[PDB]
Structure 1
């Protein structure tokens, strides 16, 4: 009988008086539409529901606590201590067993999107002048790599965000400190060993990768010429990374993709 009096009061207030403060009328109307549709909440929430078992409770509770901590640290600006807590939480989530026993749970909870919107805050600020918090970038990169690795559908999920990270994939390169965790490498991991995804990889970004490779083969790294390298007329590191990504995009399961 709740819908009854809710629908009564919501329309009764508006019939009584015109309402300023548009947030009030917005909340009133969303409540009204929710009461009238009813099944909208069901069709929106049933994709996000999940059931596991009666025996694995403490593990998934620790997982949920770690995810809540991750979101809370996301809600705060990035610093040294915040980076440390994010790294520890990512470690706990990677070590949890539910992360393997139920890969659909992570997609239902949106862990990949949370980690991506954590990493974008670090990757923002600048483009070619600051890459601060490299450990913070690397932990998210390796977490995304493993998330897309232990699945078949998480690769399709990360293929959607693949378009974004290719614009700032120039970060983390020119340094043999992260041969793993890297945005280009998580792109390669998401596109790796899947004919359907290798095909669906159309060309809004292959020309971008080729332009990046050309810029790398035309310009050397200012970081390297500052470190004291002999200033060769080109860069063999970012170019090699781009070539590796292109190889992963073209070659799949032993048979070259014709169109790619």
Structure 2
């Protein structure tokens, strides 16, 4: 024999490693037999599934068998190594007992082993394997020309259809964590950005992953002090359920990043996150939004002058004050502080700036939503001046022609004297003529029937006379 034969230690290392291959293989084959047991079991399950529990006893017969001279002589020989020596070389020993533990609880070892195990369809194997090789490329890059290969990986992975087809695999791979580690490593270089947009799109696909990266996001934000932030919002917006779970500290760090910026685009991005941080799929949660709102005022401490000087013409700080309004707009005992928004009507006349406005769409898209969330039919007659841009509507037939389809939404938003109303109603009848994307135009038809519900009525019947034409 060989193993039984005594030799000095340093061989012992290698030898036990040689053995680790064995145990590893046993674990592998075990997973595999488990899978065959799976495919064999699913049959009758689909039978009862279409038949619309007692059988289960038979699997019990094979269930206990799964648990397990071979492993025994290994454990024993390890003990012999540890007996007659007082060995040192901690590394050696570490391996030793690693193996030994691999011997004494292959059950639980199997358990920790399972997650990374995953079945795949035989048709799809080719693309998967290649993806594994590219993943192995990135893992080759784990230890690091710098700026291109990684991107090769990136592109290569986006090309894969498996990335849609097996999201659970992609979560199982844990690769997100890897590539993110690369990111951090860089952050301690231009390529970084596409890579980041990669990890972002990766995050996008599923909640069972969006969770995961959501767990990383503070860590990502320490990094976002330097666009990772995009990744963060991608990790948050789709799922309210962990949007609830977000730490305040994320946000304090976000505002902390809002400090000497104002001596900006990075500041408008910080705003963009917190814009995405609450409003979510539906109505912004009162949870997060409250904790946001508590701190909003704290870091800023004639802004309309900065606004209109900007409208007239650098292009950064203006869109900071423009995004900030939408930010304060989407957020909302809560009746106590929700009134403070309006104090810090904090805009008020700034609403009327929107009328002066006609770069541009950010300004309407921010302030209209600021207005609908906090704010009188006659006061609407005061508002009658978004109609400026309805005058601009025919000019499409530039940074403008294509802009109408998002203004198609912005017109619909404020559903919530008289001859002036005949006029801006006739602008809307011009939008009916535009009806004479397109389903959003049907929502504009809903804005029309809602304009009929809203409301001298007879001047509306005059705009309905031009509309009778």
Coarse TM-score class (shorter-chain normalised): 0.7 to 0.9
Q: Report if the CA contact (8 A) 2:179-2:199 is conserved.
A: yes
2:218 to 135, 160, 163: 163
Deviations 1:97-127 (A, max 9, x none): 1111001111111110111011111111xxx
Q: Report if the CA contact (8 A) 1:116-1:140 is conserved.
A: no
Give 5+ residue unaligned stretches, structure 2.
1-68, 289-469
Q: Determine the structure 1 residue equivalent to 2:194.
A: 139
Aligned residues: 220
> Is 2:32 the counterpart of 1:32?
no
Deviation at 1:45, TM superposition (A): 1.2
Query: What is the distance in 2 between the residues matched to 1:163 and 1:121?
Result: 16
Q: Determine the structure 2 residue equivalent to 1:104.
A: 168
> Is 2:65 the counterpart of 1:9?
no
Give 5+ residue unaligned stretches, structure 1.
125-132, 172-181, 221-235
Q: Determine the structure 2 residue equivalent to 1:226.
A: none
Deviation at 1:74, TM superposition (A): 2.1
Query: What is the distance in 2 between the residues matched to 1:114 and 1:72?
Result: 11
Q: Rg: which structure is higher?
A: 2
Q: Which has the higher contact order (CA 8 A, sep 6+)?
A: 1
Q: Report if the CA contact (8 A) 2:217-2:232 is conserved.
A: yes
Q: Determine the structure 2 residue equivalent to 1:209.
A: 254
SS in 2 for 1:168: helix
Deviations 1:232-255 (A, max 9, x none): xxxx31221111101111211130
Q: Determine the structure 2 residue equivalent to 1:225.
A: none
1:250 to 256, 261, 278: 278
> TM-score, normalization: structure 1?
0.81
Listed as ranges, the matches of 1:18-57 within 5 Å are 18-57=86-125
Q: Determine the structure 2 residue equivalent to 1:113.
A: 177
Deviation at 1:82, TM superposition (A): 3.0
2:134 to 61, 66, 74: 66
Q: Report if the CA contact (8 A) 2:147-2:190 is conserved.
A: no
SS in 2 for 1:51: strand
Q: Report if the CA contact (8 A) 1:170-1:238 is conserved.
A: no
Query: What is the distance in 1 between the residues matched to 2:284 and 2:271?
Result: 15
Between structures 1 and 2, the one with greater helix share: 2
Q: Determine the structure 2 residue equivalent to 1:197.
A: 242
